[PDB]
């Protein structure tokens with residue numbers, strides 16, 4: 001049986017992928033880049049703050065100074081952090097709280113494997129911190145998603161091999177990171193976005209311990 005579940009945060013635990021999208025789009029448009037639409041944003045889900053800004057600048061083949069790059073990333077983060085102040089337990093996605101409870105009852109470790117430096121704050125907003133055995137700090141890894149490092153780190157932090165773990169993700173970059181870690185990915189979203197080569201569920205209510213078992217048994 002699997003011994004850990006490695007949770008992405010944004011778009012898996014709660015709807016904060018939507019807020020990242022809205023904040024990046026606002027930022028892009030301030031600098032005259034209009035290509036950050038929902039389709040493009042699939043390339044930003046699960047990607048670090050700095051890598052995200054760089055992808056936006058590349059979309060338009062735009063160079064900015066190092067000083068401006070720093071200011072832009074800070075501006076978007078400040079906006080995003082204001083947006084999320086009112087996140088509460090009511091914003092936890094369906095099925096997620098009950099999954100955490102069921103995992104703990106079955107002695108399955110729970111680790112966060114988010115690309116976001118805002119992860120700990122969000123878990124606190126949602127009263128979820130006590131469910132997590134570890135949080136892999138995305139600032140500690142040498143390589144961010146789609147590199148597997150964050151998922152490997154999350155597994156190691158709870159004393160479990162990646163190959164005995166399930167990873168839950170909503171993003172192209174994160175699915176690739178899970179694959180390359182050795183963990184088993186179960187995506188949430190559209191196969192049109194995430195691929196037809198892993199198990200994908202349409203919404204998080206499908207993330208039950210019963211289903212994770214159904215999938216692991218195969």
Ligand SMILES: O=P(O)(O)O[C@@H]1O[C@H](CO)[C@@H](O)[C@H](O)[C@H]1O
Pocket residue numbers: 010020024044045046047048049052077114115116117118119
């Ligand atoms: O700015 P943060 O909260 O540190 O982090 C990151 O930026 C990306 C922007 O695309 C999001 O998609 C990530 O999921 C979120 O971790």
Ligand code: BEF
Pocket residue numbers: 008009010011045046047113114115116171174
């Ligand atoms: F979207 Be995850 F929190 F990197």
Ligand SMILES: [Mg+2]
Pocket residue numbers: 008009010011012017045046169170171174
């Ligand atoms: Mg995500």
Ligand code: NA
Pocket residue numbers: 094095096098099205207208
């Ligand atoms: Na449930």
Ligand code: NA
Pocket residue numbers: none
């Ligand atoms: Na139950």
